[PDB]
Design an enzyme around this catalytic site. Sequence first.
Site, PDB file in Angstrom:
ATOM      1  N   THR D   1       0.834  -1.220   0.000  1.00 30.99           N
ATOM      2  CA  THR D   1       0.000   0.000   0.000  1.00 30.99           C
ATOM      3  C   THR D   1       0.851   1.245   0.000  1.00 30.99           C
ATOM      4  O   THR D   1       1.873   1.316   0.695  1.00 30.99           O
ATOM      5  CB  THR D   1      -0.895   0.106   1.249  1.00 30.99           C
ATOM      6  OG1 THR D   1      -1.999  -0.780   1.128  1.00 30.99           O
ATOM      7  CG2 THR D   1      -1.444   1.507   1.416  1.00 30.99           C
ATOM      8  N   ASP D  17      -2.778   3.816  -3.761  1.00 32.63           N
ATOM      9  CA  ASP D  17      -2.706   2.828  -4.827  1.00 32.63           C
ATOM     10  C   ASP D  17      -3.931   1.957  -4.598  1.00 32.63           C
ATOM     11  O   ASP D  17      -4.719   2.230  -3.697  1.00 32.63           O
ATOM     12  CB  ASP D  17      -1.415   2.005  -4.734  1.00 32.63           C
ATOM     13  CG  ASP D  17      -1.455   0.952  -3.634  1.00 32.63           C
ATOM     14  OD1 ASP D  17      -1.603   1.319  -2.435  1.00 32.63           O
ATOM     15  OD2 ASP D  17      -1.325  -0.246  -3.981  1.00 32.63           O
ATOM     16  N   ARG D  19      -3.845  -1.797  -4.604  1.00 34.58           N
ATOM     17  CA  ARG D  19      -3.505  -3.211  -4.412  1.00 34.58           C
ATOM     18  C   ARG D  19      -3.724  -3.728  -2.989  1.00 34.58           C
ATOM     19  O   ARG D  19      -3.410  -3.057  -2.002  1.00 34.58           O
ATOM     20  CB  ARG D  19      -2.055  -3.482  -4.815  1.00 34.58           C
ATOM     21  CG  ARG D  19      -1.611  -4.917  -4.560  1.00 34.58           C
ATOM     22  CD  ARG D  19      -0.200  -5.176  -5.054  1.00 34.58           C
ATOM     23  NE  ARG D  19      -0.085  -5.092  -6.510  1.00 34.58           N
ATOM     24  CZ  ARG D  19       1.027  -5.360  -7.188  1.00 34.58           C
ATOM     25  NH1 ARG D  19       2.124  -5.738  -6.543  1.00 34.58           N
ATOM     26  NH2 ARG D  19       1.049  -5.226  -8.504  1.00 34.58           N
ATOM     27  N   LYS D  33      -8.776   2.536  -1.117  1.00 30.97           N
ATOM     28  CA  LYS D  33      -8.179   2.813   0.178  1.00 30.97           C
ATOM     29  C   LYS D  33      -8.539   4.198   0.694  1.00 30.97           C
ATOM     30  O   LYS D  33      -8.026   4.641   1.727  1.00 30.97           O
ATOM     31  CB  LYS D  33      -6.660   2.644   0.084  1.00 30.97           C
ATOM     32  CG  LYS D  33      -6.247   1.286  -0.480  1.00 30.97           C
ATOM     33  CD  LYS D  33      -4.730   1.078  -0.509  1.00 30.97           C
ATOM     34  CE  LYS D  33      -4.381  -0.240  -1.198  1.00 30.97           C
ATOM     35  NZ  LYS D  33      -2.918  -0.505  -1.237  1.00 30.97           N
ATOM     36  N   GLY D  47      -2.359  -0.785   6.092  1.00 29.45           N
ATOM     37  CA  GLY D  47      -2.263  -1.762   7.159  1.00 29.45           C
ATOM     38  C   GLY D  47      -3.255  -2.890   6.972  1.00 29.45           C
ATOM     39  O   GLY D  47      -3.434  -3.375   5.855  1.00 29.45           O
ATOM     40  N   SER D 129       3.634   0.188   2.910  1.00 29.03           N
ATOM     41  CA  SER D 129       4.888  -0.403   2.469  1.00 29.03           C
ATOM     42  C   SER D 129       5.583   0.449   1.390  1.00 29.03           C
ATOM     43  O   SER D 129       6.807   0.390   1.245  1.00 29.03           O
ATOM     44  CB  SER D 129       4.641  -1.830   1.969  1.00 29.03           C
ATOM     45  OG  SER D 129       3.614  -1.864   0.997  1.00 29.03           O
ATOM     46  N   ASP D 166       7.354  -0.744  -5.195  1.00 31.42           N
ATOM     47  CA  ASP D 166       6.963  -1.539  -4.033  1.00 31.42           C
ATOM     48  C   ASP D 166       6.054  -2.704  -4.409  1.00 31.42           C
ATOM     49  O   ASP D 166       4.945  -2.505  -4.915  1.00 31.42           O
ATOM     50  CB  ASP D 166       6.279  -0.653  -2.994  1.00 31.42           C
ATOM     51  CG  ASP D 166       5.655  -1.451  -1.876  1.00 31.42           C
ATOM     52  OD1 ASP D 166       6.253  -2.475  -1.483  1.00 31.42           O
ATOM     53  OD2 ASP D 166       4.575  -1.053  -1.386  1.00 31.42           O
ATOM     54  N   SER D 169       2.587  -2.687  -3.458  1.00 28.16           N
ATOM     55  CA  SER D 169       1.759  -1.675  -4.097  1.00 28.16           C
ATOM     56  C   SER D 169       1.634  -1.876  -5.602  1.00 28.16           C
ATOM     57  O   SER D 169       2.486  -2.527  -6.234  1.00 28.16           O
ATOM     58  CB  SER D 169       2.347  -0.296  -3.817  1.00 28.16           C
ATOM     59  OG  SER D 169       2.329  -0.004  -2.437  1.00 28.16           O
TER      60      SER D 169
END
Lengths: 244, 198, 243, 222, 244, 196, 250, 204, 233
Positions: D1, D17, D19, D33, D47, D129, D166, D169
Amino acid sequence: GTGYDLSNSVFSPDGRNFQVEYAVKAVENGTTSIGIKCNDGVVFAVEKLITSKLLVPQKNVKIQVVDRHIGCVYSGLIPDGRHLVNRGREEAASFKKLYKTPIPIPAFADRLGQYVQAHTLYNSVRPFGVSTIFGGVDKNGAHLYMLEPSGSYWGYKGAATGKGRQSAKAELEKLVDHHPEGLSAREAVKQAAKIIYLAHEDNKEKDFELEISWCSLSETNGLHKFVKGDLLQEAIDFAQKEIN
Amino acid sequence: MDIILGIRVQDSVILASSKAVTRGISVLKDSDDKTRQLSPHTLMSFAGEAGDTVQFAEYIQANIQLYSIREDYELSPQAVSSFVRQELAKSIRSRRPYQVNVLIGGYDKKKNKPELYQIDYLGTKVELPYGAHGYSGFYTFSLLDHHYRPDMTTEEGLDLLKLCVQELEKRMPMDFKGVIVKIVDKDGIRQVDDFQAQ
Amino acid sequence: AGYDRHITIFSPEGRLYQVEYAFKATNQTNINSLAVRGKDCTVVISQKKVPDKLLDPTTVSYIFCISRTIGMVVNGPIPDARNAALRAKAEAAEFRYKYGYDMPCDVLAKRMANLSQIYTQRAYMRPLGVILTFVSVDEELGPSIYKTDPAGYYVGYKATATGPKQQEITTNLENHFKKSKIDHINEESWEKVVEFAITHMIDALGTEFSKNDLEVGVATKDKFFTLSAENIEERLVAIAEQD
Amino acid sequence: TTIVGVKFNNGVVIAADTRSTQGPIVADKNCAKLHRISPKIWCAGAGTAADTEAVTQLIGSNIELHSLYTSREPRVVSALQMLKQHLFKYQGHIGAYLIVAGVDPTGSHLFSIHAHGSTDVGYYLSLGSGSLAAMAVLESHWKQDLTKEEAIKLASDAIQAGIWNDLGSGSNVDVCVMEIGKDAEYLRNYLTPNVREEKQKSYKFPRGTTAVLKESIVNICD
Amino acid sequence: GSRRYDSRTTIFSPEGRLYQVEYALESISHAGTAIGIMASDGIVLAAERKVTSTLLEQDTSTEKLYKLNDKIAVAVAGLTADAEILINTARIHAQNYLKTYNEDIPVEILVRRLSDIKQGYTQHGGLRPFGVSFIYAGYDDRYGYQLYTSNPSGNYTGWKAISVGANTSAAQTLLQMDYKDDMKVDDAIELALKTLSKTTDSSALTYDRLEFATIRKGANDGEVYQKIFKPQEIKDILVKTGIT
Amino acid sequence: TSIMAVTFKDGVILGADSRTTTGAYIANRVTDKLTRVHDKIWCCRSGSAADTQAIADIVQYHLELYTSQYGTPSTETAASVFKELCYENKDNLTAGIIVAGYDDKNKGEVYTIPLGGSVHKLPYAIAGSGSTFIYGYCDKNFRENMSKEETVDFIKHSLSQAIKWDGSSGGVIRMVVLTAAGVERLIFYPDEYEQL
Amino acid sequence: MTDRYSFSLTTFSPSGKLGQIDYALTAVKQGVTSLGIKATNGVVIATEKKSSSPLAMSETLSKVSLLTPDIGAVYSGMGPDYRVLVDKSRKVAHTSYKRIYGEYPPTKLLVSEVAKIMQEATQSGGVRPFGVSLLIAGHDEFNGFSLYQVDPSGSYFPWKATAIGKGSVAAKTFLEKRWNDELELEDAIHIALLTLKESVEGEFNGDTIELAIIGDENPDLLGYTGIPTDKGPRFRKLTSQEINDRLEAL
Amino acid sequence: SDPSSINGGIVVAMTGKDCVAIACDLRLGSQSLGVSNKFEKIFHYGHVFLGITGLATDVTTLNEMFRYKTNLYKLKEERAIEPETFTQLVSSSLYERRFGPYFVGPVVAGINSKSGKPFIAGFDLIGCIDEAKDFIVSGTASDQLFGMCESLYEPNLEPEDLFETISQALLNAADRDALSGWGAVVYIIKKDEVVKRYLKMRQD
Amino acid sequence: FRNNYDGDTVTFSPTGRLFQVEYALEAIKQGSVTVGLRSNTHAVLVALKRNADELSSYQKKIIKCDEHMGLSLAGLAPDARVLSNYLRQQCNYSSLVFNRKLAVERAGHLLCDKAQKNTQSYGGRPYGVGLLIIGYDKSGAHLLEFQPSGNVTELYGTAIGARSQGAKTYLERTLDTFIKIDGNPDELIKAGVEAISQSLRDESLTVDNLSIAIVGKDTPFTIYDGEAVAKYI
């Protein structure tokens, strides 16, 4: 109709709480007690009727201390008075534990006040049958207060309650007018002994015992203490003299 | 573990349960009956933890009998097994869960058909032609998968069990001291007192 | 049956006598109060009558500082008055801690009003014989006057008065507004608004005041404070040099 | 994320993002999100998915009730306090990490909240992340006094930094703009830089390919 | 304390009667009449809407007939609000039974539980009882079609035909006069409407003042069906039975 | 974290770095560790951000209610509420807090509340992971009743050294001056203090 | 202390009446008139803002309250009881519905919850019934528009149109004559204003009247854009100005 | 150990042209021991379907819970619950046990009776909702299912085609998983009709 | 009048009285007489034990609370058991926790507060028993008089129960004499028996009818009954 005086928290048609007023009757029927605020402290004094020679002299102490700087005296149902002081002590202990500083007299007053007021809110409890005179010295000087069964209380220059409350108030008002500059702890003690002796006429039938305590910045270091020995006898003589 | 077997044939359910009760190094009893009758046409067998086993079986028996008296009626086997699954499902997430597995064999007088339910301590319930709890299942499932038929007679079923018991006495590690067999059908529950050599 | 007059249940007329008798207790102190809104301040005036000579005048008051921005004036006995003040202070501090911002005057009023509504419905709780007037200069609403009674009722006002001679002061104010056509005192300084308040208090009651006959509270942007005998005197002298 | 927050001259904007993961598997290639606590208070969550959602709805619900009770527009600080005290009460067991932003009667606001309950304030923030990939862009291109358009570009670029670098993500970029005097504008899938290319073949099977054992109709009507 | 205002809703009269229960029944007696008639192939529920108007939205209204299960329903006589409290717990009870046993709840079991709840408010708690009477119409595989009745006391009994509410005496006499064990649903449907018609305190018995329901095992299926008639459906059946 | 509070002639000054980390990552490089619990009673927070924030928020609430009822609270009283919270919950908190306040009668006061929950009133106090590195420096350079300028310099020097050696400290140096004159916020940047 | 009033304050009298509830109803009768009218494409609820002092600012008080974005309420009787009933109603719509299904409750169900709250105050220990009657109007996808009345007993009923309070009898009779199943919202609003005029003694303008409607979705009142399915609240309170404009075509 | 691998099993749902399909295996084992080959994991309340993988006991419990809740919902709402609504009910019901969750992997499938729109949704064990427009997988062979679906799938397949596609995804996925298989059932759902089919598959 | 204000202890009469407490106080007046007196070295209790029939026993009037403390009762025997048992717990607690003998004056305060709690709350009833408490602590010999109103008083001597005024006047007359009876328990007891007999009427104190207790300097609280009191009749 009627019957507005059989249950505590009830309002009469004229907005009164008779049970509280009846409590006052128990107070007026009690021993006379007073409080005098001097220039750096407060003096407490009370009448101790000698029901009989059997009472050990100097033994049934009426005045009570809360924490180390507060004095309490009351008239009416003694047991009710002790009950209120026990609440005050817990109240003072809880305040100190969290804020560190011993409880300021004004804060202490409201603590007793809210508690006494609480006993006029429900029919499951009875109002306190005492009027209490208390005070001490704190960060900002001396403070004297009187609390009624209704929960009402204000700061006073002089205060009295009980059987001879009228004599006392008369005498206290006199002091106020003749001392705009203030009274000293030493003087307040003597004057207190006199006021009690005078107010004892409204009960001149039974013999009594005098009791005085004081809290003065210069005389007791802000701590509450009983006036005993020579300073006491000296005050008794000053009263016994002006009584004649 | 102990052996708990159940097989439903044409018009009845047969339950077989090992008679041994071993504690550590000693076999204490060799005639223990691991069963409780919940109602005239419903029998439950059990295996598991030393104390939970009976406390649970008896607790359920008490409840089903209570239901019987109050309603003057006998709950269907399906209803009983559902009550049992519910109780175990509550147990699994309680402070101290019942560590008990059970087989419920009953004859549904209304549908006039025998029924067999397998329920583990987790509250996992399944209805089957034959079932087992513990290690027995590892030998008996494929056996019956081979020698089992829906329309078999009660007598055929008992032979099917004898076949299972022999395999168990041949390959299983422990001496379970034989089994006690019971039959549940339209006429109630009875014990085949002659299986120690049938 | 005749107990529909001792606790808070309905009378055959759909009335609640205990609530009515509570209202009656509010005048027990025989003191009037009034509040008015300035251009950006709020003022509350209340009579002060300390009869006994043995009392310390400085400890007698029916005005309370509930929070940095909220002030409360109470018409009614002091013990119920103080019970209400302590509660409002508690409600004010908690609100700030939970919601992250200062409790608005109107919100505190609604909350205290709701509390009173309860003593009106539950039998073991008696109503408080007091009328509460809350004031502040709300960050969103500006000068605010909100008053609550023993019936759990409350509303916002352009100005208001409470006490035995409430009607006299109200009509006086009504008239002034019917005239000015605006819902506030078009005055920039609070001193002048305090003066307006005391002036009309005198007119409506037909009485003169000394520095010890009044109690004054003022609410400005981010602060509510009370005036001292001297602050008042200076205010009284000013109205004197206009008459 | 990868979620971010960026203040501009007259408001605040947040992005994220899309994912979702369970270990190394993408659970959802396009989840949202961005959550609405109130009309003009939005929250970007990272999280434990269910935790960010649940805590976001709970405080949102309480904000609505509070708003109705006070007859006032909700304030970002109120959401911040209610969230943090809740998260703290749970000693970090509620795996929520959030960036809460919005406009209210007191202005525009940008905060972040961590699972244990600490809050931070700033002009630009990132969590998840992809936190570092995003922050490197922000630390590289943020300047005081950005225009609504500049802010959106910066935020959006930061999210891409995470999407591309990432593994936690990816997919799309969601944005929400909160400007001091207007309605908040939620831009779902503002960017879709990961459209799957056309497959090489169609795997549509010839009917009858699957062996069926039995069939029947199901009764839905009562 | 409080004892002064305690009505004591759960005590015996010197005659061994439960005051509140009696008085609650007295309240029920003024409620719109509700009738339950059980046939061989079904059951019928019919109630008279108390207080109506031109403006009352009847399509969205329900004040006497409530669905409890897919096989059980009730007719109410008394406080609608009190009934809803009980109704909702009955709905939960049926689902609990189903969840526990994976079988629909036997009609009597549902009725006994609801009756036990009423009984409780009769023996403890100092609360008033529910001012409600129910006529239960349901079907299960153990007793087929059943008709029950429960009142404020918490007692219940089964019936072939019965009424609750106002003019029950007149209504009972009329039912006990034309009921026959071999009745057919449609026969019961007519007997029901005729009885209401003769007991009604109103001018005429129009559809707008009625709620209707039947529990029949639609032959072309094999399952039982509940049908709470709609305004038009009642208007139709009303013309047919010859009441236009 | 590097935090300290110093009493001087006119009152007291609080100082702190602005770094908050999650491991070796700087979650925030411009953190404000100087928190207000009352008009002239502030605190320096170290340890858990979540824990110290939650404690400060509660102390502020207690002092606000205290003020409503009994007027202005002393610095001692504020240090007592912190202490009560820290001691009573010692098993679930990681909060090293410095309490500093300006009083007209007492002038400046500093109370340090370390991990266990004990209280210590001192002329000045240092705390935080960075404090260890400046024990000698501060002990050798502190003097009582310095002037506002001398104190700001002492704190600026002390904290620049703490920031220099402790990876958990850094960013800008923040200060809060508390005197009869009011409340003054100060901020110093790397370019300035790094070369001291 | 401790509420020792664990027994019912509302009991049955020998005649079978529940006094406290009857009395509550009486209090409702004394209250200011309020009414509700359902149209084919909306509902309207209105009442008079009986200012209790010219110094009081009637805007600071609302007799017409939004419960959910598609449900509103108005009343007659004791305003303070109504106020707390509104707070409870807004909360219960959340705790017992939105938090479960993630959508606001349909009109009938919320009304059902409110009604329950009132029934409990009729039987629980130590309390009196609420002295108010409510008129709740709303809309929900599977039920369209609806209007309900909730009395102190906890009973509630669906209406096409109705009025409660002071001049309810007269008002109801008037509504019966003007209502029909073809009214458009504007028609209902007009009819509402007419009905209220009879019940108003003094001034009658957008400042002494309070009226809201449940009509089309107001995307303009949402506060944000971006979610197709979120189209805006159906509840809308008319402005003083909006009211006076309609009063000229009275 | 892992509660989600004790019994085994898989579920998969797919959207098609004005239709939705949901399928599952029939295995119920205990570690290596296969116990029942008739353990269906799909259920329905009105026109809304729910498949549940994971710990069998929790699979049964959630079913009984949702029947209970959907029944009362119908009594009070006077209409059957919709897919979108049910999804929320499932989500909050799961999160209600956030710290002692049911070990399941729910999957919702159905056609909104009002919009006619097809709907499918997935959930993690504590309620996180995944609402896909194409497909949803769940169970011990979820990796294999993701592989099959991401490949085999294409939008707007006709009910007859969708059946082939969802069956091939399920079958081949289960054959690479020791804990799934042992039979399977597929549901093809349209506004007016619902067809159920038991597939023929390996029995090892 | 009174009938409207004596239904419980949570109601004040229009004159400020608490009748339930007063009715309780009456129970004591209806009780058998008991005397208490002390010197500077000892404290004594003398009680008249009442019996039901001449086939019944004489109910005990004296209860030991600790080695240095004890009391005599007049009124409801059960209430005395409750109060003395509570006094025993308080004595016990003082020792266990502080290794301190509970001072008589403190025991008095504790008793007062316990009694008080039953005169201000709904549902409770006042205690219906009077208590005379004697003890020897760090300040010497003591005598306390406990009334159900909560009023506890320290005296040189006193008496409660029916016809108690007799003994009381006698003690109020003998005061200067008995208070000086130090180092001679037998004399103090005889003064006590003379005091009690001043309240006789019905009969004369016999051996299984008299009860005496003493505590002092080196004398642990001890009760004397029957033959043990013979040397005093």
